[PDB]
Amino acid sequence: VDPRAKWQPQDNDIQACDYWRHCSIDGNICDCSGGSLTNCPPGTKLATASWVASCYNPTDGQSYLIAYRDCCGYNVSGRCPCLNTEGELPVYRPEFANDIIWCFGAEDDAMTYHCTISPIVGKA
């Protein structure tokens, strides 16, 4: 609703695109295809790479640094797709660029995009 409205995180449903940790997610939630909010689904490869974002936790009033690591080596899940860009910068500032395939580091050289996890990597 109103794709152009200020982002408004919630902290009650991790499979929804307004869940506080997905503030800078681009792709699909791993929780919808066998993974978890922070683990990859069976069969995929965990990347070492990621894009980060600092997202507001409405529940505690704090901000944490989210490292969006992708689970790869599989075709896109197709379930629970999101595209949030809270504080996303141009490609020339990769650390915060979310159109990039952040599969670097996955075993076996997996570079195909399946889904993205939202683990917290630290405050603020």
Side-chain angles (χ1 to χ4, degrees):
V1 334
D2 206 6
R4 286 162 293 270
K6 196 74 253 65
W7 162 250
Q8 55 338 104
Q10 45 88 353
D11 179 24
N12 50 63
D13 184 354
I14 69 175
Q15 304 185 343
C17 301
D18 52 5
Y19 175 62
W20 81 271
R21 293 197 201 191
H22 306 335
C23 82
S24 211
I25 206 160
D26 172 25
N28 294 252
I29 303 163
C30 296
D31 194 46
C32 310
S33 61
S36 62
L37 176 86
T38 66
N39 291 320
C40 297
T44 58
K45 296 333 212 281
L46 220 201
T48 41
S50 74
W51 52 87
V52 297
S54 112
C55 303
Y56 184 62
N57 184 351
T59 274
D60 65 13
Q62 319 210 26
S63 288
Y64 313 64
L65 208 262
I66 322 291
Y68 298 107
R69 291 227 247 170
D70 285 354
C71 302
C72 326
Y74 252 63
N75 177 207
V76 72
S77 71
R79 299 204 75 256
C80 298
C82 307
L83 206 215
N84 295 310
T85 60
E86 289 295 304
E88 189 265 358
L89 314 172
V91 76
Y92 71 73
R93 284 284 264 306
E95 204 214 320
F96 299 104
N98 84 9
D99 295 331
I100 299 168
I101 299 312
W102 297 124
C103 285
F104 300 110
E107 259 159 315
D108 277 318
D109 293 336
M111 286 298 298
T112 37
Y113 176 75
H114 181 63
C115 67
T116 299
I117 41 165
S118 299
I120 276 154
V121 116
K123 220 153 293 226

